[PDB]
Design a protein around this ligand. Sequence first.
Ligand SMILES: c1ccc(Nc2nccc(-c3c[nH]nc3-c3ccccc3)n2)cc1
Length: 257
Amino acid sequence: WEVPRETLKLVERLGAGQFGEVWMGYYNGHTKVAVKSLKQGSMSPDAFLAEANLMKQLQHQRLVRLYAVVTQEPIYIITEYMENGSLVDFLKTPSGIKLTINKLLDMAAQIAEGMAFIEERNYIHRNLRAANILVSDTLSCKIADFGLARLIEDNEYTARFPIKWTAPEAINYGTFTIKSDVWSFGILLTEIVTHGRIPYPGMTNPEVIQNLERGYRMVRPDNCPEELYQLMRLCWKERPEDRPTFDYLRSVLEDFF
Ligand SMILES: c1ccc(Nc2nccc(-c3c[nH]nc3-c3ccccc3)n2)cc1
């Protein structure tokens, strides 16, 4: 896993944020990679590399894979280069806006599959949203930034607090489980079918929290099949035990058409 820095050549900066940068580069001369680097002092090396350790423990076709790390400063985590970057950005592009509902739900099904593996293995995501899904040249989706002890912000490694994906039990008591991820996934489905639109459009974060106290749920988005809306509503059941498993979500999305 540890590799010498000279095995890597960083070519182009993909983003810069509060805690570091992400670069496209090449590994061993030919393998196109993305390189996340830690801005010194943001957090400790061990806190940063925790993401890498989690990638090792959970390997799956729908999960971002660890290629290597560089443990001397600047610290690097290295993965496969994904041509289309973050799902939330890709959905807003010319190509993303033209995707059919069939293709959007195939992508949703891939995300549910990855989440079904995380559930099966008794882990949680905690940061599940379109921003933390990566998309390949063939439109295959991979889950990033899973299993962390901490809640991340989207401006840490690119230019841009997130509560619009957080289940009520997590807001009120800090209770995070796979069922709070199921909640987050329902919100992610709204991102998918609205070509990347922000949830709860024209509410601020405090207004969302006030509305959730009163049991508020988003209406059916314009581009949204009724059956897909009823799946979102199941994701957003107040009691976590009433929310479906990821196993179930995967099966319904895979067989949707
Ligand atoms: C624009 C166009 C393409 C890409 N490609 C890409 N490919 C793989 C990963 C990433 C990326 C974006 N944010 N964080 C990462 C990331 C980088 C290394 C390890 C773990 C996550 N990013 C990113 C931005």
